[PDB]
Design a protein around this nucleic acid. Structure first.
Lengths: 432, 433
RNA sequence: AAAA
RNA sequence: AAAA
């Protein structure tokens, strides 16, 4: 699936010019037609600054005013139906109004918007045009794209192209080439940051500190993350460190994460004070890093949702999860660890024993006086530590035990063992 | 070490205004003086475009023109002269003259320039200003900056701050606030690229096929790299996959890497045609991804050179190297592998046994089942695979051998063994890309 | 070329 | 420690 993203400023002030790109030529005031003609994208995203808004009655009359004039202009040069328009929150003192807020709200807002548009299934071919955006909006849009495509690259092949035209110089211009300024095959980069302190999800820009303590107290998100923070960090660690059984058991509730983000989102929007006479928007809450982390976490969950197999969690299923999720030395580590448990299960099967609800240490046949659960042993053995995992073999009549054992041997963490592992993986994620 | 990097356009076109930043305030046409007042950097880097220069009698009269005008502008404003100026190869047809070539030249040029500036020892606090920058130069400077800092963050703590001022609107503007648009603890990202084909180092932009083929065919770099490729990729993989013995045995020659980057950079430089009459700069050669990879490879080697030692490689040495290079489950896996060989050395020592030039499989006491060398076992055992490693125990008189065996036990790849590991690690680096 |  |  091919995707085109473009960073736009004040699209009206652009002049009639012609553009060359990929054995084609075009005439008009923007690059989008000839980009759409050569690239043939399955979908197009237009990131604009809201600061081009003129009518200041409220927030919906700014998001509307801007969307009216955008859709007018896309008709003028024929950009078709397959188009999403992200009106990011810009800032500054302009001719037709004022806009005050955190500069970084544009990143978090566009991160959030992109994370609902970019597909979570199949391979991605992403095309980015920086020709006519603001310096900071184009930079923040770029970083927001790469942050999400990095997570997408875990499960799928992701290629990224960035474009920019020859500079438009008004007095001496004949035609502007669309120069390719980047081509990269995007590296798989799973979420590798903990969830921050419960002060870094929404922050007060121009809100009184006593009023903040009031609204922070009413948000059900921060109270529900008080419980789940450690269970979610355990899942983040599962991908980063190669713990396939922890990946499955700690798999987050996607409906629940949707609702946390929706609440922080509409809480932010509802703190935007619009004065129609002073012509001045004021975003009194700013998005914190924690909002970013939840959006990246939800995106990583959607990307990997296909790998959440039905219980019980057998060796054959853990191999299958691992083969999709991990690469390099991590994948081979996990395969040797599962292979060890499988070979033991084969030996048992040949003797006609099928141990049920046996600690992994007893299954592998360990000495006593090594029951302490260490970081080293949890991370070095793909999270399959001898003192925190319980093994079960569902009894069957073997014919080819070397093939059957993997399907019939099931692993789970003991309730005590899962809390120790959560603590270890969460701590290791914070020391990073 | 605090570093300020600043993306600039036509500084002569900018209007006088006021800037707010970190409690202090500033009158002037540029953000740099207040950025310096508040951040108090140890060194400042200004990144701007060739396309500002006005003298086409030579390519070196064109850079000293831009440099002189930049030096004069720093006098006009409060800014100090403690600065490096990077004049990147820009594109476009302007009134004062024309500039043609690959747009991606700016990326590779700035990457190269920054690799010679960014210190390869100590922690790094990096501050990046994009207010005055032009779109592509700023994206490409940001990109090149992050790519090098990611390699730096393997050995040292690196923090990245990014700034952009409120947008400027004529006469409405009283004071432009300088916003922080990024604050990042830079993740350790070792190089995960193979060296590409000999098509992708220098390419012809505007040059006859035969003249290019002559220039390409004159490069010592491409001939040497043909044979050196696999050892360098084996080294790249050692950082990525957690193979501490391969890191030491395959540590590249910095002199040769320096030599390859100088040659390709001079070939590119010398292929710039400056037409004095009709005011035109044509860069007849373009940099390829291969140039970028080499610049990054040398930077990573400079960053890690402090870990290298002479040929006898002890378990204690592999421990201390691993604890600097590796993190997460990769580090913990390496320590378990070393721990196993250490614990076997302790056992041997208590018996008064000190085996020499013995295969690791015989050292650990293995079956005759599996002699084949597989990617699975090479990558899962931190490259310490039983059929490619030789153990040597330097004889001593033990008293507390649990603490003594580490220094007196040494690991070597066999000549056959090392070639098997080079293939597996090289192939795995190319399959993972 | 601080809204190609 | 069936390369724990």
């Amino acid at each position: 699936m091919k995707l085109l993203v473009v960073s736009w400023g004040d699209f009206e002030r652009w002049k009639e010019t012609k553009y060359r790109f990929g054995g084609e030529t075009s005439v008009g005031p923007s690059t989008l037609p000839i980009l759409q003609k050569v690239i043939k994208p399955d979908w197009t995203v237009i990131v604009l600054s809201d600061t081009i808004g003129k009518d200041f009655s409220s927030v919906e009359t700014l998001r509307e005013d801007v969307r009216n004039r955008v859709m007018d202009f896309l008709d003028r040069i024929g950009a078709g139906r397959e188009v999403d328009v992200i009106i990011a929150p810009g800032i500054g003192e302009f001719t037709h109004g004022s806009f005050r807020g955190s500069a970084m709200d544009a990143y978090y807002y566009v991160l959030h918007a992109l994370s609902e548009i970019i597909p979570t299934k199949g391979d991605l071919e992403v095309h980015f045009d920086s020709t006519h955006g603001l310096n900071y909006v184009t930079l923040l849009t770029y970083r927001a794209l790469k942050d999400l495509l990095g997570i997408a690259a875990v499960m799928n092949t992701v290629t990224f192209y960035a474009y920019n035209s020859d500079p438009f110089v008004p007095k001496i211009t004949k035609e502007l080439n669309i120069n390719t300024i980047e081509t990269t095959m995007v590296k798989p980069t799973p979420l590798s940051e903990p969830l921050p302190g419960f002060d870094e999800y929404l922050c007060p820009y121009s809100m009184e500190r006593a009023e903040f303590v009031r609204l922070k107290g009413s948000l059900n998100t921060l109270k529900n993350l008080r419980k789940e923070k450690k269970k979610l960090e355990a899942w983040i660690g599962s991908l980063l460190f190669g713990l396939p059984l922890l990946f499955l058991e700690e798999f987050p509730d996607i409906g629940r994460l949707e609702s946390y983000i929706e609440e922080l989102a509409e809480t932010w929007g509802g703190a935007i004070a619009v004065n129609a006479e002073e012509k001045a928007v004021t975003r009194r809450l700013a998005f914190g890093s924690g909002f970013g982390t939840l959006v990246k976490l939800l995106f990583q969950a959607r990307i990997t949702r296909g790998l959440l197999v039905e219980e019980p969690y057998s060796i054959e299923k853990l191999y299958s999860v691992s083969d999709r999720l991990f690469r390099g030395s991590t994948l081979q580590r996990v395969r040797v660890e599962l292979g060890k448990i499988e070979d033991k299960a084969i030996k048992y099967a040949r003797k006609g024993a099928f141990p049920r609800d046996i600690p992994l240490r007893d299954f592998l046949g360990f000495d006593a006086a090594n029951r302490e659960v260490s970081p080293r042993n949890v991370l070095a053995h793909a999270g399959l530590e001898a003192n925190v995992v319980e093994v079960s073999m569902e009894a069957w009549e073997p014919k080819r035990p070397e093939e059957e054992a993997g399907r019939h041997t099931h692993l789970k963490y003991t309730p005590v063992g899962l809390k120790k592992v959560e603590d270890i993986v969460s701590r290791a994620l914070k020391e990073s």
